[PDB]
mmCIF file of C-alpha atoms and ligand atoms in Angstrom:
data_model
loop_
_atom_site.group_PDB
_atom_site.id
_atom_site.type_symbol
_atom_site.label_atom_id
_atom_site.label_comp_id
_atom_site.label_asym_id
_atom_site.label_seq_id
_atom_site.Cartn_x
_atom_site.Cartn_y
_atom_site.Cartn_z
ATOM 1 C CA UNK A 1 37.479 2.639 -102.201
ATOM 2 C CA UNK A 2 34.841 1.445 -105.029
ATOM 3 C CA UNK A 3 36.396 -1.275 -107.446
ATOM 4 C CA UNK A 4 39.909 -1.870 -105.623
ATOM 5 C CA UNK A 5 41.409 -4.690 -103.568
ATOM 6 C CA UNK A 6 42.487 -5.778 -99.952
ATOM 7 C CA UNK A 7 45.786 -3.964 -99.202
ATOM 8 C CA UNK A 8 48.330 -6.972 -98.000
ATOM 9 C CA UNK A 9 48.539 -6.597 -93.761
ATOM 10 C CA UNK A 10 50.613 -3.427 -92.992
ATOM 11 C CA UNK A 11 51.667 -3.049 -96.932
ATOM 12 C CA UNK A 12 51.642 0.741 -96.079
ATOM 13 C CA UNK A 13 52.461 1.565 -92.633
ATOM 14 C CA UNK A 14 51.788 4.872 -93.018
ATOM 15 C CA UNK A 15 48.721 4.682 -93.735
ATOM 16 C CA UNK A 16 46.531 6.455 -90.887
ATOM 17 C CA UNK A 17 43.001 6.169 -89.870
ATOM 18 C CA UNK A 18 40.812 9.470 -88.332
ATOM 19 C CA UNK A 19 38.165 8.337 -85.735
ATOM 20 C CA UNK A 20 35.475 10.012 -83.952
ATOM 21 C CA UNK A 21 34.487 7.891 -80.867
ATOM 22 C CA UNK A 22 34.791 4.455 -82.289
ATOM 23 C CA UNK A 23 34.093 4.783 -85.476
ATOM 24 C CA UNK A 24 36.230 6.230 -88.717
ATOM 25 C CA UNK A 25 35.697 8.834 -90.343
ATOM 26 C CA UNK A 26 38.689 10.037 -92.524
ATOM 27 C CA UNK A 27 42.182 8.747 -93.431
ATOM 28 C CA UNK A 28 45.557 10.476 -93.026
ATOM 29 C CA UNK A 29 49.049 9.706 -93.844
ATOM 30 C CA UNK A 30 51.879 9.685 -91.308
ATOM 31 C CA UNK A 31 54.485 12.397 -92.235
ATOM 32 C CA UNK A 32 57.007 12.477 -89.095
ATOM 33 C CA UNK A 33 57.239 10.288 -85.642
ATOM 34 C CA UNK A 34 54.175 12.838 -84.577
ATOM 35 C CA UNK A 35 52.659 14.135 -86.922
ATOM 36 C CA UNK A 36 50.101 13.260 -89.955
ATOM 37 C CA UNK A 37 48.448 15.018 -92.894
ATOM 38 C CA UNK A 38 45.223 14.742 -93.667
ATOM 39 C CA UNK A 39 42.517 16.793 -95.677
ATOM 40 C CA UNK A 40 41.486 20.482 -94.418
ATOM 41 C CA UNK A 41 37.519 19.074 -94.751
ATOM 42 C CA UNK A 42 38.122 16.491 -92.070
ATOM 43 C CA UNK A 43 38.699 18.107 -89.062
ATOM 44 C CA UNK A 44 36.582 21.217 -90.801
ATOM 45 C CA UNK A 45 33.568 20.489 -88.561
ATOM 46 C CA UNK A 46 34.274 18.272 -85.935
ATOM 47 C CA UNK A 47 35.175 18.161 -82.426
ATOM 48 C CA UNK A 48 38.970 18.125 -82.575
ATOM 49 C CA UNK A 49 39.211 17.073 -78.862
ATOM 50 C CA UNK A 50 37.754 14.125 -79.251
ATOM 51 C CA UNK A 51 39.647 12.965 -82.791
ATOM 52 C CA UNK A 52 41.361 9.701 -82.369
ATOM 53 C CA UNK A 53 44.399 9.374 -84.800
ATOM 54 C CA UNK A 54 44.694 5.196 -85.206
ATOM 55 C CA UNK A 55 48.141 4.170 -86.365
ATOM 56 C CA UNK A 56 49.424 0.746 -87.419
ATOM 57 C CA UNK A 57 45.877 -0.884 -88.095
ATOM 58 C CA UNK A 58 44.598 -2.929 -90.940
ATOM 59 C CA UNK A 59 41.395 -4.346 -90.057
ATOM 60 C CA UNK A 60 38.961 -1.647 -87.876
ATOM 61 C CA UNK A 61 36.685 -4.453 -86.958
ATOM 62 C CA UNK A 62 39.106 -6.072 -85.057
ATOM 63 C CA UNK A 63 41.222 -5.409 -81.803
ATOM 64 C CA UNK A 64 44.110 -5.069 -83.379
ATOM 65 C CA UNK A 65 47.538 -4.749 -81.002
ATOM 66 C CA UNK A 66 49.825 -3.213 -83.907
ATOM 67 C CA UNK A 67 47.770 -0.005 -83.501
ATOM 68 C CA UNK A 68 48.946 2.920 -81.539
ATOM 69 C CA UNK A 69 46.383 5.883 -80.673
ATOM 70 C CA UNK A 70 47.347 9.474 -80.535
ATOM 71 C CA UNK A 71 45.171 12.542 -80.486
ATOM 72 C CA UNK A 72 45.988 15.817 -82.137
ATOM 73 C CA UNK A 73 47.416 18.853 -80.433
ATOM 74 C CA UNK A 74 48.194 21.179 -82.850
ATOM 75 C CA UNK A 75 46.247 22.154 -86.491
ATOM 76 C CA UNK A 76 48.225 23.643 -89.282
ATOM 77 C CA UNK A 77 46.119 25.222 -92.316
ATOM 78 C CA UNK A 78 47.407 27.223 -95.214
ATOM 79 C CA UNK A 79 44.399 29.235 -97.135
ATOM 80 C CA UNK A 80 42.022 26.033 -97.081
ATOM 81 C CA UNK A 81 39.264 27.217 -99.565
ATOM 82 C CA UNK A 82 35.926 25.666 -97.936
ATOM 83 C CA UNK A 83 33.704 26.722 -101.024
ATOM 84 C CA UNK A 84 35.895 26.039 -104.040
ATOM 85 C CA UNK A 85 37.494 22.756 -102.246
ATOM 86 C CA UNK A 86 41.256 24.354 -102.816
ATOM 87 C CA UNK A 87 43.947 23.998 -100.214
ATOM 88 C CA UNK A 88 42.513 21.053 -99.055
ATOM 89 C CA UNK A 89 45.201 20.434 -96.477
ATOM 90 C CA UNK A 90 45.942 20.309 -92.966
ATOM 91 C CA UNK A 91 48.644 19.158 -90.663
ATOM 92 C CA UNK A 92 47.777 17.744 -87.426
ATOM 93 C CA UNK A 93 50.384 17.506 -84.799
ATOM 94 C CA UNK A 94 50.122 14.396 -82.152
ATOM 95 C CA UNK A 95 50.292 14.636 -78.272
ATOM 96 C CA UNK A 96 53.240 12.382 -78.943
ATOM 97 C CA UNK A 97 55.326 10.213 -81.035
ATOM 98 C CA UNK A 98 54.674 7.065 -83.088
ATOM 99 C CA UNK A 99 57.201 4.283 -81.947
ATOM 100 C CA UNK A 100 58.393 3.427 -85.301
ATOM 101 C CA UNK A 101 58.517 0.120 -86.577
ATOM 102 C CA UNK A 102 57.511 -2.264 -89.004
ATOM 103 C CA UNK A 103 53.615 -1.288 -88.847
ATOM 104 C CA UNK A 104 53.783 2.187 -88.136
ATOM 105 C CA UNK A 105 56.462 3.903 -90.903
ATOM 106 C CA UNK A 106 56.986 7.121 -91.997
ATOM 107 C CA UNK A 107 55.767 8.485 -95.865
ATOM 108 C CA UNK A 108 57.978 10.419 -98.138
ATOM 109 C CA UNK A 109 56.957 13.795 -99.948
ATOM 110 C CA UNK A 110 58.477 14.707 -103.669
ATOM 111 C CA UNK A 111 60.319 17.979 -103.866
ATOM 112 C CA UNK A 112 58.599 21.092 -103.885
ATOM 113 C CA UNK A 113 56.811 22.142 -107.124
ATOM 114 C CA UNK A 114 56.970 18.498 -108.557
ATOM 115 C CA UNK A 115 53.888 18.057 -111.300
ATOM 116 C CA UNK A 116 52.969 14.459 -112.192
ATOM 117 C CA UNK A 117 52.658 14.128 -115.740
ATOM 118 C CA UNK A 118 48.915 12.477 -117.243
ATOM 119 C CA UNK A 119 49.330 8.544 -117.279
ATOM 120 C CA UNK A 120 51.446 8.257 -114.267
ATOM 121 C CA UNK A 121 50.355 5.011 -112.585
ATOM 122 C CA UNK A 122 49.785 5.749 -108.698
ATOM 123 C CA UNK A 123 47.866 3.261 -105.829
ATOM 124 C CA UNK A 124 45.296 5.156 -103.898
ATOM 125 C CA UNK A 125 44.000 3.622 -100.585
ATOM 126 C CA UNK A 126 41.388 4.295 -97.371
ATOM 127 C CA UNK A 127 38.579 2.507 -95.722
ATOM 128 C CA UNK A 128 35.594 4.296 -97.268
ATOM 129 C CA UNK A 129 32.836 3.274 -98.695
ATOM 130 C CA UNK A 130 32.861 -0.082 -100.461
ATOM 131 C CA UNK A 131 30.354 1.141 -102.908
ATOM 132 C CA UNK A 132 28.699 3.798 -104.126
ATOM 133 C CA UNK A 133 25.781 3.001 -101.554
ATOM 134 C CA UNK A 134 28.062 -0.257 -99.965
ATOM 135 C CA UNK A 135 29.104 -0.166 -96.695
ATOM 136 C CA UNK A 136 32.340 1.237 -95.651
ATOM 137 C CA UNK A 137 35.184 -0.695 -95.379
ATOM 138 C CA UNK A 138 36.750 -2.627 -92.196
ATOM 139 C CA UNK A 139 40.185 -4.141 -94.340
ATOM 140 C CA UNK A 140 42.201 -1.080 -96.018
ATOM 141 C CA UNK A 141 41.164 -1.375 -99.777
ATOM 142 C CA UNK A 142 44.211 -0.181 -102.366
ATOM 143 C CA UNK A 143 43.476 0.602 -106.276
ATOM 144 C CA UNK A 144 45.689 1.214 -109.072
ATOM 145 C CA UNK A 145 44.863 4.795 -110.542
ATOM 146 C CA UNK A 146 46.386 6.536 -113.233
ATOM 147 C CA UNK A 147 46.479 10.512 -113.507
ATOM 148 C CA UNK A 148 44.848 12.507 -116.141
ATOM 149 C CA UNK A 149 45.052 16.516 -116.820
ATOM 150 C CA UNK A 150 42.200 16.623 -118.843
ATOM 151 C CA UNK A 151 38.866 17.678 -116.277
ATOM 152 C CA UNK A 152 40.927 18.620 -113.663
ATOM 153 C CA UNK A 153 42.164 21.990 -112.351
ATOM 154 C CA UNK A 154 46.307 23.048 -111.735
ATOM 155 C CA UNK A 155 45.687 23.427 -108.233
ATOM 156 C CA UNK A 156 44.448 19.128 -108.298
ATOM 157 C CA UNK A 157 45.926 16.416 -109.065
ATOM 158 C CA UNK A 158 43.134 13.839 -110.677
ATOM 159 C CA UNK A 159 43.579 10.389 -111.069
ATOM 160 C CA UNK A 160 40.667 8.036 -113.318
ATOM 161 C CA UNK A 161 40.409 4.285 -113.329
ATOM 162 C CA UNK A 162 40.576 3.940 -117.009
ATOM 163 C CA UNK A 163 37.074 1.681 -118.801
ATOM 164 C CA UNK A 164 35.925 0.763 -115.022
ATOM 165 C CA UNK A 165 33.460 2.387 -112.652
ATOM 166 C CA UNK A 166 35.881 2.758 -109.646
ATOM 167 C CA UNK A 167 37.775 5.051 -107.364
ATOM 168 C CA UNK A 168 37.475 6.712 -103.855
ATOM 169 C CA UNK A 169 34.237 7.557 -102.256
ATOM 170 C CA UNK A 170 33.089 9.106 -98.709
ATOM 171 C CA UNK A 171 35.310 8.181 -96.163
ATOM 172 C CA UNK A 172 38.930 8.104 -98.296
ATOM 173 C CA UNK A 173 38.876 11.994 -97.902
ATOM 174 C CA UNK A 174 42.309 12.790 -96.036
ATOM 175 C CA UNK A 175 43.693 9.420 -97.796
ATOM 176 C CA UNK A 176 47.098 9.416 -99.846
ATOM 177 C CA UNK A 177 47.834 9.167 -103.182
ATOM 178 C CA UNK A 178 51.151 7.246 -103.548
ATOM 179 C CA UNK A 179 52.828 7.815 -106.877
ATOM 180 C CA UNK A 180 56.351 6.220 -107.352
ATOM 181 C CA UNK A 181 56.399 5.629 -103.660
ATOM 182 C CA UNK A 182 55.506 8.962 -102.510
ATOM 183 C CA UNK A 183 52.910 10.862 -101.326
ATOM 184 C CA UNK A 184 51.638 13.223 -104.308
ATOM 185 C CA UNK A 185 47.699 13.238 -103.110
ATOM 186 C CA UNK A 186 45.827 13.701 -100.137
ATOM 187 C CA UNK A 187 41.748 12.340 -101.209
ATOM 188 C CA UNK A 188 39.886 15.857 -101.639
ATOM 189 C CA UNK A 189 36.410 15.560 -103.742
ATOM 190 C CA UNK A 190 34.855 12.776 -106.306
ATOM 191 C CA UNK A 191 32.961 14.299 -109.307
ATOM 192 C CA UNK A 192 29.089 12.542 -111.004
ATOM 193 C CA UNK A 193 29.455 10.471 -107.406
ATOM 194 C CA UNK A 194 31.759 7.549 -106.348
ATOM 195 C CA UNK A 195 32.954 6.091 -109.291
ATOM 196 C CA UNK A 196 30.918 7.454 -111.915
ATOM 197 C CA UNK A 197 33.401 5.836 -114.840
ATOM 198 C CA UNK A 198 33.222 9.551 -116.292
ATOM 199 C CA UNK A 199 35.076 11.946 -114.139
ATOM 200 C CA UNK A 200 38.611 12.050 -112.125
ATOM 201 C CA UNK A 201 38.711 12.094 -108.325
ATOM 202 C CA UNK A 202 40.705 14.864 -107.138
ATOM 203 C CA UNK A 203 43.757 15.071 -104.633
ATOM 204 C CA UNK A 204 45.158 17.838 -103.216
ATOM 205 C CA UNK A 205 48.579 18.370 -104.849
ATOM 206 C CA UNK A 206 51.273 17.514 -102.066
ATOM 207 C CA UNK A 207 54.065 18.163 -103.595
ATOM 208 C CA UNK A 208 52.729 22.809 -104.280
ATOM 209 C CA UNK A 209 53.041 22.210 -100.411
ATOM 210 C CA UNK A 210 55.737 20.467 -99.200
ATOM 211 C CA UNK A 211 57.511 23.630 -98.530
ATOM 212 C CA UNK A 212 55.173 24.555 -95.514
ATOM 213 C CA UNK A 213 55.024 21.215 -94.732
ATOM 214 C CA UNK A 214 58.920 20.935 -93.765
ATOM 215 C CA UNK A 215 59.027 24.419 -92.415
ATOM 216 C CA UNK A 216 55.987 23.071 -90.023
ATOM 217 C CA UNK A 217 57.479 19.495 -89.219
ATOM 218 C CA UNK A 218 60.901 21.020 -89.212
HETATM 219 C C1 LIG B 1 35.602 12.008 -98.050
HETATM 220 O O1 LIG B 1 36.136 10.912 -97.932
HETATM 221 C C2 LIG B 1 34.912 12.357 -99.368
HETATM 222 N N1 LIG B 1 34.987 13.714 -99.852
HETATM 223 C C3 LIG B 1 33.911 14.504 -99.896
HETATM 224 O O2 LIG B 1 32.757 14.230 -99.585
HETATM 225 C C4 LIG B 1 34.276 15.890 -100.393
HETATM 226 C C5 LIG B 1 34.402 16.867 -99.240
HETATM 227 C C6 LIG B 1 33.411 17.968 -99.383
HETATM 228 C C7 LIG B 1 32.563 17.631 -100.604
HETATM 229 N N2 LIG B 1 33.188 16.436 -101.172
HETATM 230 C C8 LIG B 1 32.906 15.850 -102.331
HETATM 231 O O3 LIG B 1 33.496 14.853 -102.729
HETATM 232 C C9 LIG B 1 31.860 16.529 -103.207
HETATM 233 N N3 LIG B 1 32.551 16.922 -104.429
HETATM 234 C C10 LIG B 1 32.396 18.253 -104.685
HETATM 235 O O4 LIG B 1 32.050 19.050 -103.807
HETATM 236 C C11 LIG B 1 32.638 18.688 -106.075
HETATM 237 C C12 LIG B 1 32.159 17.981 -107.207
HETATM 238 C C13 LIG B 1 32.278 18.533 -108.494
HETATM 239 C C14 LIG B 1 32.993 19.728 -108.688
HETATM 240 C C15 LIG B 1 33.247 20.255 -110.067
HETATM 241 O O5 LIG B 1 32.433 20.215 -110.983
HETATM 242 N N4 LIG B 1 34.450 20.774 -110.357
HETATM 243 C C16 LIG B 1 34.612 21.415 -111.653
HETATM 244 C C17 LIG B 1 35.766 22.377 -111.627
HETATM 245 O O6 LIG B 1 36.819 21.619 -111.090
HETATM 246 C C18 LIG B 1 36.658 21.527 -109.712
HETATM 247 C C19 LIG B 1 35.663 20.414 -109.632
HETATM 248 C C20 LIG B 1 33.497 20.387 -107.546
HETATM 249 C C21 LIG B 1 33.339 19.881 -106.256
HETATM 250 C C22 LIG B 1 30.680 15.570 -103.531
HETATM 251 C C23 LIG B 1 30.225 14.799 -102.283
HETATM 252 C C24 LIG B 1 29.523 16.364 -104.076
HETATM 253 C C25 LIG B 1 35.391 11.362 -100.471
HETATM 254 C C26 LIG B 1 36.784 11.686 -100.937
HETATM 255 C C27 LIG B 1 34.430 11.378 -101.650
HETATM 256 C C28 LIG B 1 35.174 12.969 -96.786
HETATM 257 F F1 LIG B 1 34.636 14.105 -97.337
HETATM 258 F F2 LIG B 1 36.071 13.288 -95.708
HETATM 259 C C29 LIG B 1 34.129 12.273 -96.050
HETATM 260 F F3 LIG B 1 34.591 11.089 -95.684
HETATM 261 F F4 LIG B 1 33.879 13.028 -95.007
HETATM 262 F F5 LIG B 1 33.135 12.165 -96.889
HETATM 263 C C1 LIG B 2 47.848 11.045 -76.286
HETATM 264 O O1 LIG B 2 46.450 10.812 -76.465
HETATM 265 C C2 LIG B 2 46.132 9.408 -76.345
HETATM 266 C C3 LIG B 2 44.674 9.245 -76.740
HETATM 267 O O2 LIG B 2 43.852 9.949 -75.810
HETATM 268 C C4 LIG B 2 42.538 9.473 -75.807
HETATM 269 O O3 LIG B 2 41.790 9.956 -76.923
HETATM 270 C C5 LIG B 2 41.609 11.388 -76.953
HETATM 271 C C6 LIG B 2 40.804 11.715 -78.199
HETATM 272 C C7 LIG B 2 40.924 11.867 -75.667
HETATM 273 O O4 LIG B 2 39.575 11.414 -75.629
HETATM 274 C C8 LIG B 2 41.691 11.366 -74.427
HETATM 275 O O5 LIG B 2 40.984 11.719 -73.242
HETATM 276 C C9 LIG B 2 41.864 9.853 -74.486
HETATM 277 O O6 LIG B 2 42.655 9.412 -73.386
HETATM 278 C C10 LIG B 2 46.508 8.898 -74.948
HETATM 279 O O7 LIG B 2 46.220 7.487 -74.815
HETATM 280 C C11 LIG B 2 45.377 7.124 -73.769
HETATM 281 O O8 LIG B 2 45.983 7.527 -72.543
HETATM 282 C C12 LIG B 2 45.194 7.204 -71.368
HETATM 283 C C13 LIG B 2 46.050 7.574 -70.169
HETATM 284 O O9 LIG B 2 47.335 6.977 -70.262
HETATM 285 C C14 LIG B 2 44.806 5.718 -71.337
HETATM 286 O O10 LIG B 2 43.905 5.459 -70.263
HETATM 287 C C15 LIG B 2 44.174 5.309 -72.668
HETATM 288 O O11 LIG B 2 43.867 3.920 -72.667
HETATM 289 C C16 LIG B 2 45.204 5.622 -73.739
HETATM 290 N N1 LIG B 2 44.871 5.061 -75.037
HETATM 291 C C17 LIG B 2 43.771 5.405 -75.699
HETATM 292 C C18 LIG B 2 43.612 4.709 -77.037
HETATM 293 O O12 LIG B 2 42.920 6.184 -75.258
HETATM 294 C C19 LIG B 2 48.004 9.154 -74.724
HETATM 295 O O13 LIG B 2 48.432 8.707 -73.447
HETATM 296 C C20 LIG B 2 48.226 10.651 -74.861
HETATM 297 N N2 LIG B 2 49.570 11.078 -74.505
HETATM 298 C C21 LIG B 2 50.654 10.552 -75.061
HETATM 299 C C22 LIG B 2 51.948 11.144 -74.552
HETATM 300 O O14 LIG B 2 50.635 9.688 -75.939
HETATM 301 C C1 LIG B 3 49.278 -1.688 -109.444
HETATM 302 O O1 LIG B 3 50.093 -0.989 -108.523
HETATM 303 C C2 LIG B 3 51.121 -1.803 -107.958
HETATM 304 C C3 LIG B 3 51.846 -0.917 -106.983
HETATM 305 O O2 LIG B 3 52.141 0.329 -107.645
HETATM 306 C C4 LIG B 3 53.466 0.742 -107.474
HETATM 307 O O3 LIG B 3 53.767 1.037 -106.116
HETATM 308 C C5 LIG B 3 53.048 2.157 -105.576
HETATM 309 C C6 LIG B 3 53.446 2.271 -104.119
HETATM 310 C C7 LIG B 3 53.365 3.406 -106.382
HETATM 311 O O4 LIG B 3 54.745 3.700 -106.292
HETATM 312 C C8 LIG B 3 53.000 3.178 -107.839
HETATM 313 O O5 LIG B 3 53.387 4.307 -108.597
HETATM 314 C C9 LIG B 3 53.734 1.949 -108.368
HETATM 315 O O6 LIG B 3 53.282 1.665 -109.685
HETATM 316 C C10 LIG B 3 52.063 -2.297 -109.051
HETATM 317 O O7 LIG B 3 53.012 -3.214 -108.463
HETATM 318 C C11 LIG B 3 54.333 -3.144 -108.878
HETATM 319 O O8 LIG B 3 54.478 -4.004 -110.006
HETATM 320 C C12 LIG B 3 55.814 -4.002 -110.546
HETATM 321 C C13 LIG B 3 55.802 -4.887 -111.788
HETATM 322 O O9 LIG B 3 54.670 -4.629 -112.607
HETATM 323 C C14 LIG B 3 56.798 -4.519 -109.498
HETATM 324 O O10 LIG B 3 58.124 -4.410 -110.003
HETATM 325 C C15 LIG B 3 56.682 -3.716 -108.206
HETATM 326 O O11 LIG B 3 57.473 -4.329 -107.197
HETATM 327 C C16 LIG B 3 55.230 -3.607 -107.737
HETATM 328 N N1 LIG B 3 55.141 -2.641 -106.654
HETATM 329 C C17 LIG B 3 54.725 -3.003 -105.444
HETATM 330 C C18 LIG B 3 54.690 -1.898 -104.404
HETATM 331 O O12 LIG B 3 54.356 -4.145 -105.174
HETATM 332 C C19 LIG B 3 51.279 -3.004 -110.156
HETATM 333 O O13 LIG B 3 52.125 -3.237 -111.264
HETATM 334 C C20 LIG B 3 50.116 -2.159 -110.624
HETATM 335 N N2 LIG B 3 49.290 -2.949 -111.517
HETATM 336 C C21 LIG B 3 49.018 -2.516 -112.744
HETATM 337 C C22 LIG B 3 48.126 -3.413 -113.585
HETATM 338 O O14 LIG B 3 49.477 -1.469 -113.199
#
């Protein structure tokens, strides 16, 4: 996140961090006791096998007790569009099931079909890059967004950090987008690079899927 500020520890226990041995590589967003959604480009081309799912952390320096690892079992896509970046979501099903409690909590969806009008205020959040070449980060980073129609497609939902060069960069792909407390982005594709102060970030719209996603996690 480029231009935000250290998320309070376990402010959003939902909040879920993708690793490849050690080290991470995208975030995801806890949707049911086992399972998490995350962007279609993540596990795209990567060894699935050896994905880590990190729960309950803050901090990915440190040793951190609070976390719980799972690994995925089960990949749910629904027309992911690798070349025009559309569909940009997947579900990934654990080998097992989160103990729930006050670091690891589950997120809530809006209702099918629900559009977020331009000028909503909405907090976006991931470890990614700190800067547009600045390392990535090791405390979650949070930033107050607000949505915007105009450069974006339907089939988006774009958020700009109005008069500031800020927003997500590599590494928040897979990351949520929490508007009025629920989940109405999943961190897709940045636009003139991280933070460019010119163009919207774009999420993949949630709630045109929350249909499959309840059919899926029942
Ligand atoms: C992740 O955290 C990052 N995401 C990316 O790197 C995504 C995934 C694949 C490519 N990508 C981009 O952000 C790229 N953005 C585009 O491909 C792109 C830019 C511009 C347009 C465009 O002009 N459009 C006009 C019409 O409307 C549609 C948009 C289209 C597409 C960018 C690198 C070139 C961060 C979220 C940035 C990650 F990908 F998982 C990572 F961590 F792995 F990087
Ligand atoms: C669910 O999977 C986790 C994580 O598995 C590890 O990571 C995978 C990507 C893969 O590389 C596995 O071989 C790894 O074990 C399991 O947690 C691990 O379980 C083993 C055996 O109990 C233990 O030695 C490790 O320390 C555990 N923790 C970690 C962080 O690896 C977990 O047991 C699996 N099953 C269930 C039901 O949760
Ligand atoms: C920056 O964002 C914070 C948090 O945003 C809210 O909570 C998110 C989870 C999401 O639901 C957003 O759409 C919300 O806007 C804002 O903090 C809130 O501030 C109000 C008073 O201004 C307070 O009543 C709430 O309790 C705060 N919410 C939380 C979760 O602490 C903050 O106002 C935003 N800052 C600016 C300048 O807009």
């Amino acid at each position: 996140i480029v231009g935000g500020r250290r998320a309070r520890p376990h402010a959003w226990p939902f909040m879920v961090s993708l690793q490849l041995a050690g080290g991470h590589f995208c975030g995801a967003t806890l949707i049911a006791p086992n399972f998490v959604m995350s962007a279609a480009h993540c596990v795209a081309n990567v060894n699935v096998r050896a994905v880590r799912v990190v729960l309950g952390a803050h901090n990915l320096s440190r040793r951190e007790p609070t976390r719980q690892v799972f690994a995925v079992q089960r990949i749910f896509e629904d027309g992911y569009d690798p070349v025009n970046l559309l569909n940009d979501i997947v579900i990934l099903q654990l080998n097992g099931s989160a103990t729930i409690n006050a670091n690891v909590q589950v997120a809530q969806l809006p209702a099918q079909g629900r559009r977020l009008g331009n000028g909503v205020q909405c907090l976006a959040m991931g470890w990614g890059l700190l800067g547009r070449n600045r390392g990535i980060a090791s405390v979650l980073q949070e930033l107050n967004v607000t949505v915007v129609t105009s450069l974006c497609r339907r089939s988006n939902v774009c958020t700009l950090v109005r008069g500031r060069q800020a927003g997500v960069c590599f590494g928040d792909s897979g990351s949520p987008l929490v508007c009025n407390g629920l989940i109405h982005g999943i961190a897709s594709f940045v636009r003139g690079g991280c933070a460019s102060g010119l163009y919207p970030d774009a999420f993949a719209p949630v709630a045109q899927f929350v249909n499959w996603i309840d059919s899926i996690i029942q």
